[PDB]
Amino acid sequence: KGVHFDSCNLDDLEWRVDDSNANNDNNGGGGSNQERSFSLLPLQKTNTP
Amino acid sequence: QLQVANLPKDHQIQDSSHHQQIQQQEQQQQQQQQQSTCQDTIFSIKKQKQGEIGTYKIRNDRDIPFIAQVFDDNGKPFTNYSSLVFDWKSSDQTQAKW
Numbered sequence: 001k002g003v004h005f006d007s008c009n010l011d012d013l014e015w016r017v018d019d020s021n022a023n024n025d026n027n028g029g030g031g032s033n034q035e036r037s038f039s040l041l042p043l044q045k046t047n048t049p
Numbered sequence: 050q051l052q053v054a055n056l057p058k059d060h061q062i063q064d065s066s067h068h069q070q071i072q073q074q075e076q077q078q079q080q081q082q083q084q085s086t087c088q089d090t091i092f093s094i095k096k097q098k099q100g101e102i103g104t105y106k107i108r109n110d111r112d113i114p115f116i117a118q119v120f121d122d123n124g125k126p127f128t129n130y131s132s133l134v135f136d137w138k139s140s141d142q143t144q145a146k147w
Contacts, residue, residue: 027088
């Protein structure tokens with residue numbers, strides 16, 4: 001406890017925003033991107049940081 | 050968890066007529082299209098969190114069996130749990146009644 005790995009490259013992670021009311025509806029609906037407090041930003045295809 | 054009790058049908062003799070698999074896939078592909086929009090239905094129950102009451106659309110004028118499915122809290126169903134006592138309730142016994 002207090003030790004990590006010396007390095008990590010594992011950049012492709014399955015990041016999401018989750019919506020707090022989505023309890024029932026197992027349906028492929030295009031939900032309106034208006035009610036959220038947040039949005040996940042795109043990764044740029046600029047030079048590797 | 051609450052679930053709808055899908056009873057078995059009568060065990061009619063297992064004929065091996067391969068054609069049945071085609072009509073099963075024809076129905077499964079139609080059901081997969083219906084699963085995009087019909088998600089509000091009682092046949093579309095998604096596994097709830099503890100206390101997470103879900104609204105489901107259901108048609109009136111019928112009787113319907115339900116099952117009380119019990120799990121260990123590693124998440125496994127027990128292969129027998131017939132030592133427990135259950136308690137079946139409704140908010141209104143005019144609208145829906147055990």
